Design a protein around this ligand. Structure first.
Ligand SMILES: CCCCCCCCCCCCCCCCCC(=O)O[C@H](COC(=O)CCCCCCCCCCCCCCC)COP(=O)(O)OCCN
Ligand SMILES: CC(C)CCC[C@@H](C)[C@H]1CC[C@H]2[C@@H]3CC=C4C[C@@H](O)CC[C@]4(C)[C@H]3CC[C@]12C
Ligand SMILES: CC(C)CCC[C@@H](C)[C@H]1CC[C@H]2[C@@H]3CC=C4C[C@@H](O)CC[C@]4(C)[C@H]3CC[C@]12C
Ligand SMILES: CC(C)CCC[C@@H](C)[C@H]1CC[C@H]2[C@@H]3CC=C4C[C@@H](O)CC[C@]4(C)[C@H]3CC[C@]12C
Ligand SMILES: CC(C)CCC[C@@H](C)[C@H]1CC[C@H]2[C@@H]3CC=C4C[C@@H](O)CC[C@]4(C)[C@H]3CC[C@]12C
Ligand SMILES: CC(C)CCC[C@@H](C)[C@H]1CC[C@H]2[C@@H]3CC=C4C[C@@H](O)CC[C@]4(C)[C@H]3CC[C@]12C
Ligand code: NA
Length: 586
C-alpha cells in the first residue's frame, strides 16, 4: 500500500475528538478563562519549543531530500503570489494592504505540528518514516520565507492610518522581519541547527527524556486548546465575506494541494516510480491541512480583519477532515487490484456510516425532543432520517457478514436496501410535500398514504428483487449482491425519484407554522445531486460492465453519498439547535 490508509480514520477521530472535546468543555464552561490562558501559554512556550528543539537537534541534514522542499516551497510561494496579486487588484483601497498581507498567509500557512503531524505520522510510521522529518522543517522555513512579505504589507496598512505619507521604508521592512524572529518556532529552529553542530546529533539521555515529556504533550494540548478557542468565533458574516471564505479555503485546500503535487512531479526526478508516487501523494496530503491557529493570532496582533480570518481558520479546520480522508483514499485507488479495491470501497462505506449515524442520532434527538415531528414537513424529514439511520446501521452489520452464511446475508441485504430505496424515494416524497405546502391550498396533504408509499414501495421492490434475481455470495459489494436486475431496480428507483423530486421543486417556482421551506428545499436539492451520481453509476455499469476507468472514482463518491447523506441532513437540521429545545432539555 505504501500509505497505511487503514490507520487514517482512527487518527482523524482521535485528532478531531480532542478538538471537539475542547469545544464541548469550553461551551459547557468546564475550563475557565484563566485556565485557558494557562493551557494556551504552556503550549506556545513549553510544549512547542521543546518539540521543535528536540526534532531539529537530532535531524540528519546529510540524508535530507531537499528536492521535496523546493517543490513545496515554490508551490506555497506560487499560491502566495497568486492570492496577494489578486487581492491587491480588486480589494477596496481603504483595507487593501491588510488583506494583501494576511490572506496570502491564510492560504499558505497550515497547521502542521498540532494536527498535520498525527495524520502524517499514522500514515507513514513504517512505510516512509523519513516523510516525518519534512513536516518539521517545511513549516518553519515556509514561515520565514513568506510571512515576512505578508507582515510588511500589514505594516504599510498600519502606517497608512498613521498617515505621514507612508514614510520610514526601512522601519516597515524592519518590523516585518522582526515579528518573524520573535515567533517561537522560527528562532527555536535556529537554536536547533545551532545545537545540531555544537552538541552534534547526539543528545544527553536525561535531556532527551525531558524533551520527550514536553514534546509528546504538544499535539494533545494544542488540539484541545484549538477547540477551546473555537467557542464563539463563527459570526454571521455578510455575503461578500461569505464568498471570500469560499475562495480562501479553496486556495488552501484545493489549489495548494494540486500545486504541491504537480511541482513534485517535475522537481523530483523519482528514479523509483513507486517512491515517486508516494512523494507526490504525500505532497498532495500536506497541502490539504487546515489554516494554522497562529494566523488568527496575527490578525489580533495587527488588529486587522480578525473576523474573516478567525472564521476561516475554524471552518477550514473542520472542512479539511473530509477532504483529507476522501483524497487520501482516492490517491490509493490507482494502485489497487480490483479485488482489494472492492474491500477499499466497503472500508470507506463502513466508517463513513459510523460517523454519519452519530450525526443522525443527534439529529433525531433534536427533531424528536420538540414537537417538530408533529408538524407536517418535519414529519416527512423524520421518516427520511430514520431511513438514513438504518442504511448506516445496515452497512455496519453488512461489513461483518458480507462473506458469511447465506441466511445472514439475505436479511441484512433486505434491511440495507429496503431503507436505501426509501432514502431515494423519500427525497421525491419530501419534495412533493413541499409543493403541497408551498401551493397553500385547503388540501389535507395525505401524509398517511405518503408514509405507507415511502416505506411500502421499497419493500415491494426488494421483494420483487428477491423473487427475480441471482444471488452472489462472492460479491463483496452490496450493490452487486444481485445481478444486473439489482442495477435495473436501483436505476428505476433512482430514475422515478428524480422526476417526482425534480418536477415538484420546479412546480414550486411556478407557484411562487414553523416550517423551513428554504432548509427543506436545500436538503432536497443536495439529495438530488447524490441521485444523479448514483443514477449515472447504474447507467454506466449497464452499458459497460467492465470497471477501471473514472467509474472507480464515481463508485467511491456514490458510496460516500449513500452512507454520508446523514451528514448532509445534520448540517441542516442537526446543527441549528438554537433555543427550540434548549429550554425544553434544560
Ligand atoms: C463560508 C463558507 C465556507 C466554504 C467552505 C468550503 C470552501 C472550499 C471548499 C473545499 C475545498 C476544496 C476541496 C474540496 C472539493 C472537492 C475536491 C477535493 O479536494 O476533495 C475531493 C473530495 O473530498 C471531499 O469529500 C470534500 C467534501 C467534504 C467537505 C465539503 C467541502 C465544502 C463544505 C462547505 C462548508 C461550508 C462552511 C459553512 C460556513 C459558515 C477529493 O480530492 P481529490 O482531488 O479527489 O484527490 C485525488 C486527486 N489526486
Ligand atoms: C458529527 C458527529 C461525529 C457527532 C455530532 C454530535 C455533536 C455535534 C453534538 C454532541 C454533543 C453536543 C454538545 C454537548 C454540550 C454542549 C454544551 C452546551 O452548553 C452547548 C451545546 C453543546 C456545545 C453541544 C453542541 C452539539 C454537540 C457538540
Ligand atoms: C485560487 C482561487 C481558488 C482563489 C484565490 C484567492 C483570491 C483570488 C481571493 C481570496 C481572498 C479574496 C479577496 C478577499 C476580500 C476582498 C475585499 C473585497 O472588498 C473585494 C474582493 C477581495 C479583494 C477578494 C478578492 C479575491 C481574493 C483575493
Ligand atoms: C468521512 C469521515 C470518515 C472522515 C472525516 C472524519 C470525521 C472526524 C469528520 C467528518 C465530518 C466532520 C465534522 C464536520 C463539521 C462539524 C461541525 C462542527 O461544528 C463540529 C465538528 C464537526 C461535526 C466535524 C467533526 C469531524 C468530522 C465528524
Ligand atoms: C427496515 C426495512 C425492512 C423497512 C423499514 C420498516 C418500516 C415499515 C418501518 C421502519 C420505519 C417506520 C416508521 C418510522 C417513523 C414513523 C413516523 C411516526 O409518526 C409513525 C410511525 C412511522 C410511520 C414508522 C412506521 C413503521 C416504519 C415505516
Ligand atoms: C419505481 C417507484 C419509485 C415508483 C414510484 C412510486 C411513487 C413515486 C408514487 C406512486 C404513487 C404516488 C402517490 C399517489 C398519490 C398521491 C396523492 C397526492 O395528493 C400526494 C402524493 C401521492 C401520495 C403520490 C406520491 C408519489 C407516489 C408514492
Ligand atoms: Na506561509
Amino acid at each position: 500500500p505504501s500509505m497505511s490508509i487503514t490507520r487514517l480514520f482512527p487518527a482523524l477521530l482521535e485528532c478531531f475528538g480532542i478538538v471537539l472535546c475542547g469545544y464541548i468543555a469550553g461551551r459547557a464552561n468546564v475550563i475557565t478563562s484563566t485556565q485557558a490562558k494557562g493551557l494556551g501559554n504552556f503550549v506556545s512556550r513549553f510544549a512547542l519549543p521543546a518539540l521543535l528543539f528536540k526534532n531539529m537537534v537530532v535531524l540528519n541534514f546529510s540524508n535530507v531530500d531537499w528536492s521535496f522542499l523546493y517543490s513545496i516551497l515554490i508551490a506555497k510561494a506560487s499560491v502566495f503570489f497568486i492570492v496577494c496579486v489578486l487581492t491587491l487588484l480588486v480589494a477596496s483601497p481603504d483595507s487593501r494592504f491588510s488583506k494583501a498581507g494576511l490572506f496570502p498567509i491564510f492560504a499558505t500557512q497550515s497547521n502542521d505540528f498540532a494536527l498535520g503531524y498525527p495524520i502524517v505520522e499514522a500514515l507513514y510510521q513504517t512505510t516512509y518514516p523519513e516523510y516525518l522529518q519534512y513536516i518539521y522543517l517545511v513549516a518553519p522555513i515556509s514561515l520565514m520565507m513568506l510571512n515576512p512579505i505578508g507582515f510588511i504589507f500589514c505594516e504599510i496598512q498600519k502606517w497608512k492610518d498613521t498617515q505621514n505619507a507612508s514614510q520610514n521604508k526601512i522601519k516597515i521592512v524592519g518590523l516585518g522581519l522582526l515579528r518573524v524572529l520573535q515567533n517561537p518556532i522560527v528562532f527555536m529552529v535556529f537554536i536547533g541547527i545551532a545545537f545540531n553542530f555544537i552538541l552534534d546529533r547526539k543528545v544527553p539521555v536525561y535531556v532527551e527524556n525531558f524533551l520527550d515529556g514536553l514534546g509528546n504533550s504538544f499535539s494533545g494540548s494544542a488540539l484541545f486548546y484549538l477547540g477551546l478557542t473555537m467557542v464563539g468565533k463563527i459570526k454571521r458574516l455578510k455575503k461578500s465575506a461569505f464568498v471570500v471564505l469560499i475562495l480562501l479555503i479553496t486556495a488552501k485546500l484545493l489549489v495548494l494541494p494540486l500545486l504541491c503535487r504537480e511541482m513534485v512531479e517535475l522537481l523530483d526526478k523519482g528514479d523509483s516510480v513507486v517512491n515517486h508516487t508516494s512523494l507526490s501523494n504525500y505532497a498532495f496530503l500536506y497541502g490539504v491541512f487546515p489554516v494554522a491557529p497562529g494566523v488568527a493570532i496575527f490578525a489580533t496582533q495587527f488588529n486587522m480583519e480578525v473576523e474573516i480570518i478567525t472564521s476561516g481558520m475554524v471552518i477550514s479546520t473542520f472542512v479539511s477532515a473530509p477532504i483529507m480522508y476522501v483524497s487520501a483514499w482516492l490517491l490509493t485507488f490507482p494502485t489497487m487490484d480490483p479485488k482489494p479495491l472492492a474491500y477499499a470501497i466497503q472500508n470507506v462505506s463502513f466508517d463513513i456510516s459510523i460517523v454519519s449515524l452519530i450525526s443522525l442520532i443527534w439529529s433525531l434527538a433534536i427533531l424528536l425532543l420538540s414537537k417538530k415531528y408533529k408538524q407536517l414537513p418535519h414529519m416527512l424529514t423524520t421518516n427520511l432520517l430514520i431511513a438514513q439511520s438504518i442504511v448506516c446501521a445496515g452497512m455496519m452489520i453488512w461489513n461483518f457478514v458480507k462473506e458469511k452464511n447465506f441466511v445472514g446475508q439475505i436479511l441484512v441485504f433486505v434491511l440495507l436496501y429496503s431503507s436505501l430505496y426509501s432514502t431515494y424515494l423519500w427525497t421525491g416524497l419530501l419534495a412533493i410535500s413541499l409543493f403541497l405546502l408551498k401551493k397553500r391550498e385547503r388540501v389535507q396533504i395525505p401524509v398517511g398514504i405518503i408514509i405507507i408509499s415511502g416505506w411500502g414501495i421499497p419493500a415491494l421492490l426488494v421483494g420483487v428483487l428477491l423473487i427475480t434475481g441471482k444471488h452472489n455470495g462472492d460479491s463483496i459489494d452490496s450493490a452487486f449482491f444481485y445481478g444486473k436486475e439489482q442495477m435495473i431496480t436501483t436505476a428505476v428507483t433512482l430514475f422515478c425519484s428524480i422526476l417526482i423530486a425534480g418536477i415538484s421543486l420546479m412546480c414550486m417556482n411556478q407557484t411562487a407554522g414553523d416550517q423551513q421551506l428554504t432548509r427543506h428545499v436545500l436538503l432536497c436539492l443536495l439529495l438530488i445531486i447524490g441521485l444523479f451520481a448514483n443514477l449515472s453509476s447504474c447507467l454506466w455499469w449497464l452499458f459497460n460492465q467492465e470497471p477501471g476507468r473514472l467509474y472507480v472514482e464515481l463508485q467511491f463518491f456514490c458510496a460516500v453519498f449513500n452512507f454520508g447523506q446523514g451528514f448532509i441532513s445534520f448540517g441542516i437540521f442537526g446543527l441549528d439547535k438554537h433555543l427550540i429545545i434548549l429550554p425544553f432539555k434544560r
